[PDB]
Each structure stands twice: as structure tokens, then as C-alpha cells.
Design a protein around this nucleic acid. Structure first.
Lengths: 50, 277
DNA sequence: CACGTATGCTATAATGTGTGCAGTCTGACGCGG
DNA sequence: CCGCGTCAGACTCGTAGGATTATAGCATACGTG
RNA sequence: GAGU
């Protein structure tokens, strides 16, 4: 919107290419992470954690 | 009486006489000449062949009637391109056209999202290959195992298998229980809530108030150039031409007005900074 | 020209469907023979 | 009359995600960077 | 599977 054009011109803060779809703890449940499992396809570079 | 579409159609086809070779040749000479009647009689005499073939190709592609009509279209191509002089029988030639037309129809119409023939046929070779692999591996093959067999990229195989992913109905009720469908759960993500809508009101209105804090000249330059209080985002030349010739002076007043807003923000920005989430 | 999407022809003879389920509820109120 | 058909059949809560098949093989044709 |  023209307002955000003006505002992002003022502050610079040009919005980046990546968003955010991170898995987070569902609200009001709280606990301890006891295990993690990783599944990767045959060809994609594995994570350090994997 | 008898109200089935299919039964009625099959009865009608039944009441047309089957042709011999010499008859087909005689008829067909006149049909290439453009006899009209000859073409009609050859078509109608050979409809039963179409139904025999559509019977086979049916199964799960489409409705039997649908297959029959497309098959008829193939048979018509065959009657138009038949060669009576060549000793080969008509039924032999027609079979090719009928199967062809039916197959091509079921490659297009069957899929809700229309898949082009090249993609479909590629995908089919991936499938047949998967079947051979699965026989010998005992197991259904991975994407990379199929790719290793074809000596091709895994990304190619993957993209094709993604296209094969068939659709689910939004109306299908969930959990073997006629309780509620997918539609009942599935939100409109584009439509934000009353929260987001009210935040835009608040935002836009705070910007009006902030624009009025500045000079009459700065505020008007900003309004016209941003397209905020104006209609169109007037370029430097447009704003200058309406006010002060100097196109460069528009840039100067504009940048000056932005810096006065930054001052208001460092002073009272304690509200503005919280607009960052 | 290439890349993506389409239309096309192949020549032993072959010429009327079936298929996969449905399981049958109940008391009431109208509508052609 | 008999028979065949159509129309209805309580209200909120829950759980969990998910599945099938197969369409040849090759040459020409149309539209965009 | 939960009260009705």
C-alpha cells in the first residue's frame, strides 16, 4: 500500500526473500523434547543435525 | 418401458447389417467419391466394432457411453481415410483409429487439470519402468531407483510423480462418518481477521495525522508523490509541474519531509517502533 | 531455431453392455391405471 | 383400492489423516522470445 | 468415544 511505500522509504527496511513457516510449540502445551527424528530424500544434502 | 441410455443405443446399432469384403469395397469406392449414403451405411454397419473395443478400454477411464462416442469419432476418421484398393480389411484399419482416438481422449479428459500428451506419455514410461523394477526388487521402487534405471535426473522423476498426485474432493466428509467435510476445516488464509483489517485502519489514519504535523508544502509533496491523498503516484515532473517547476525541488522537499518525520519518530516514535512485529 | 502444446497416422482379422456393488427401514401422503 | 414413489427422521462436542488406474510411438504443426 |  502507498503508505508502506512511504514508510519503507523512510525507514529503508526493505523487506527480505524468505518467510517463516517454522514449527512451534502449540499454545499452552509445554514439555521436554525427548527425541528427534530426521527424514531426508536420497539426494538432498543432509543437515548437520541429521 | 426401457429407459437406459445404453440399452437404447445398443439396440439401435444392432439393427444394421454386417458387411462382406466385396460389399465394403463397393461401398467404399463410392464413399471416397462422396456418396454420403455409402459412408453412413459403412459407419452404421461397423458401430458394433466400436462398442466391442470401447468395452475393453473402459474399465475405469470414463463412462462406457463416453468411450463409445469418442470411439465413433475414431471410426469416422477411419471411414474418411480408408483405402478400398488395398487388400487389407476395413475392421483391421478401423481398430487402429478407434483405439487411438479413445486413448487420446482419456489422456485429456480424465484428468481434472488437463495434462499435455507429452507429459502424460513420459509419466507412463516412468510407470511401466517402475513396474519392471518392482517385480525384480520385490518392492515398489523409489524415485531415485527409477531414475537410476532411466539414467536420468531424480528431479525429473520427482516432478513427474508430483503431477501424478491425484485430487481430493473438498466435499468428501472425513473419517468414514458423514459428519463434516474438508470445506468445514479449510480456512480462507488470504482473508485476515477483523484484527488485521482494523490494524490497517489504525495505520492509515495515524499516517494522516503524522502528515499534517509537517509543513503544508512537505505534506502536499508527499501526498501527491506517494499517491496517498492524491489519486495517482505522480512522478517528479508531474508534481513539479503542478506546483514549482523545479523537478529537483520536489525531491528536495520530499526528502526534507521524510527527515522531519524521523524527528517526530525519535521523539514520539515510541508508538511507531511497536508497528514492527 | 527452439520450447511447449497439439494434432495425426499406423493396414491379418477382430462387428450388441454386464460386473460390481445394493442392501432390502418406517409410517405417511399422493398419483396413474 | 393397490402399488410404487418421495419425503422426512434432535442438539452440541470429539479423534485422526488418507488411497486407484493408465492411456503406443513418432512425425508434423502452431505460438513466443 | 463425551453429556444429553
Amino acid at each position: 500500500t502507498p503508505e508502506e511505500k512511504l514508510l519503507r522509504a523512510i525507514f529503508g527496511e526493505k523487506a527480505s526473500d524468505v518467510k517463516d513457516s517454522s514449527l512451534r510449540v502449540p499454545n499452552g502445551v509445554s514439555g521436554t523434547v525427548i527425541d528427534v527424528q530426521v527424514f531426508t530424500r536420497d539426494g538432498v544434502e543432509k543437515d548437520k543435525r541429521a | 418401458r426401457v429407459l437406459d441410455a445404453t440399452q437404447l443405443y445398443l439396440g439401435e446399432i444392432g439393427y444394421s447389417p454386417l458387411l462382406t469384403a466385396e460389399e465394403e469395397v463397393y461401398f467404399a469406392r463410392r464413399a471416397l467419391r462422396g456418396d454420403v449414403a455409402s459412408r453412413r451405411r459403412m459407419i452404421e454397419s461397423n458401430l458394433r466394432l466400436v462398442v466391442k473395443i470401447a468395452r475393453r478400454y473402459g474399465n475405469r477411464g470414463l463412462a462406457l457411453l463416453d468411450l463409445i462416442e469418442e470411439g465413433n469419432l475414431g471410426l469416422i476418421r477411419a471411414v474418411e481415410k480408408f483405402d478400398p484398393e488395398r487388400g487389407f480389411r476395413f475392421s483391421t484399419y478401423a481398430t487402429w483409429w478407434i483405439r487411438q482416438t479413445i486413448e487420446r481422449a482419456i489422456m485429456n479428459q480424465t484428468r481434472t487439470i488437463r495434462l499435455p500428451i507429452h507429459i502424460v506419455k513420459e509419466l507412463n514410461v516412468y510407470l511401466r519402468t517402475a513396474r519392471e523394477l518392482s517385480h525384480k526388487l520385490d518392492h515398489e521402487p523409489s524415485a531415485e531407483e527409477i531414475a537410476e534405471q532411466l539414467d536420468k535426473p531424480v528431479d525429473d522423476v520427482s516432478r513427474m510423480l508430483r503431477l501424478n498426485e491425484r485430487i481430493t474432493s473438498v466435499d468428501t466428509p472425513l473419517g468414514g462418518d458423514s459428519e463434516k467435510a474438508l470445506l468445514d476445516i479449510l480456512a480462507d488464509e488470504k482473508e485476515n481477521g477483523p484484527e488485521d483489517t482494523t490494524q490497517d485502519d489504525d495505520m492509515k489514519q495515524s499516517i494522516v495525522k503524522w502528515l499534517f504535523e509537517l509543513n503544508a508544502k512537505q505534506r502536499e509533496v508527499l501526498a501527491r508523490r506517494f499517491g496517498l491523498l492524491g489519486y495517482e503516484a505522480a512522478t517528479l515532473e508531474d508534481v513539479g509541474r503542478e506546483i514549482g517547476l523545479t523537478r529537483e525541488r520536489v525531491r528536495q522537499i520530499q526528502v526534507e519531509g521524510l527527515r522531519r518525520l524521523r524527528e517526530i519518530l525519535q521523539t514520539q516514535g515510541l508508538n511507531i517502533e511497536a508497528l514492527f512485529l
